[PDB]
């Protein structure tokens, strides 16, 4: 389940030559590095404690590569403008996600490489790291252009090599941080809703990693389609929050139970109002 990813974003700035470029790296969904074109002094920066292990040459090297990406995204955005017959007067976006996943056996599980224009799928490298999948006609142009040039082999090499190399290293250096858990602190609240009905909220707070499952049950059945589940949100200190509520008849609250499943919980919790 381990993984590493770099989410890159280039936003064109009408009238200007250089687009804004932002690169964020992640290991097991935790931001660990970031480069922002706007900074007073553009440079990849540490975003996780365990990254303080890297010497000055590391940041120097990563920063140079970023400069290279800036140019690539700059030219690509210009090309895309042409593909879609768009005007340069407006702002446009080109995004890229790339990285690798490790299975339970530790070998490489899969490599990834996908691009999006204006926030929509554009083109993606298939799992075989040899063929491309284009989302539309414009992308078809890119696809045919890249097959003829053999870009796939370039990406495949990085994805099966350097990507795996550094992921193992990072997982090794930040082991104590990345492999930790903070089981959720949960509780149920009771709120007025409408006549003869009340709301019961099951809260899960300060947990890590973000993965979690909250369920409600009524007489042995999970209330799948009658439960409001909010989207997981960051507490701001590295941990997350989430809750699921149900509307129940006033007087029958005791018939409902909430279960919390998290990897920091050897046994699922079971609460009720």
């Amino acid at each position: 389940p381990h993984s590493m990813r770099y989410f890159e974003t280039a936003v064109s700035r009408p009238g200007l030559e250089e687009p804004r470029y932002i690169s964020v790296g992640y290991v097991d969904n935790k931001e660990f590095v970031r480069f922002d074109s706007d900074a007073e002094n553009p440079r990849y920066e540490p975003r996780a404690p365990w990254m303080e292990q890297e010497g000055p040459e590391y940041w120097e090297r990563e920063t140079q590569k970023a400069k290279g990406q800036e140019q690539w995204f700059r030219v690509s955005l210009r090309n895309l403008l042409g593909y879609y017959n768009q005007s340069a007067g407006g702002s446009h976006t080109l995004q890229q996600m790339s990285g690798c996943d490790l299975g339970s056996d530790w070998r490489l599980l899969r490599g990834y490489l996908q691009f999006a224009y204006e926030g929509r799928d554009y083109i993606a490298l298939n799992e075989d790291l040899k063929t491309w999948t284009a989302a539309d006609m414009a992308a078809q142009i890119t696809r045919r252009k890249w097959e003829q040039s053999g870009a796939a082999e370039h990406y495949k090499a990085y994805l099966e090599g350097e990507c795996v190399e550094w992921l193992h290293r990072y997982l090794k250096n930040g082991n104590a941080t990345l492999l930790r858990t903070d089981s959720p602190k949960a509780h149920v609240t009771h709120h007025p809703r409408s006549k003869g009905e009340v709301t019961l909220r099951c809260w899960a707070l300060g947990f890590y990693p973000a993965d979690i499952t909250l369920t409600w049950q009524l007489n042995g059945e999970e209330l799948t389609q009658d439960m409001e589940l909010v989207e997981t949100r960051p507490a701001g200190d590295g941990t997350f929050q989430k809750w699921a509520s149900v509307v129940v008849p006033l007087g029958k609250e005791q018939n409902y139970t909430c279960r919390v499943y998290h990897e920091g919980l050897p046994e699922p919790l079971t609460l009720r109002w």
């Binding site: 990563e62 690539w72 690509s76 890229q96 691009f115 554009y122 083109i123 252009k145 040039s149 550094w166």
Partner: peptide, 10 residues
């Protein structure tokens, strides 16, 4: 370690 895109642009 970040990737450096292939010489071919979109």
């Amino acid at each position: 370690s970040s990737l450096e895109n292939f010489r071919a642009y979109v």
